[PDB]
Design a protein around this ligand. Structure first.
Ligand SMILES: [Cl-]
Length: 85
């Protein structure tokens, strides 16, 4: 029951993404969606989503702090490639 989805989210310049992530082996999984952030506002990211790509950058195989680092420099439109829980 897995289907790859492409979702595009707008992240205003004074609004954090507000999503937390965890590693399950090489997989990167969304843990919490925080109220007030761009993720929550968009309604397009879900707890349990496995993140494959963000703006073309491969995400599988990366650790939690690497991912947060990458996100911190991404503004404007963010295109996620993911597998829903
Ligand atoms: Cl803006």
């Amino acid at each position: 029951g897995e289907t790859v989805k492409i979702v595009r989210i707008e992240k205003a310049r004074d609004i954090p993404l507000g999503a937390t992530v965890r590693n399950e082996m090489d997989s990167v999984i969304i843990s919490r969606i925080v109220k007030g952030g761009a993720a929550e506002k968009s309604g397009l990211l879900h707890e349990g989503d496995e993140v494959l790509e963000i703006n073309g950058i491969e995400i599988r195989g990366k650790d939690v702090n690497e991912v947060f680092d990458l996100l911190s420099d991404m503004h404007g439109t963010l295109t996620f490639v993911l597998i829903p829980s």
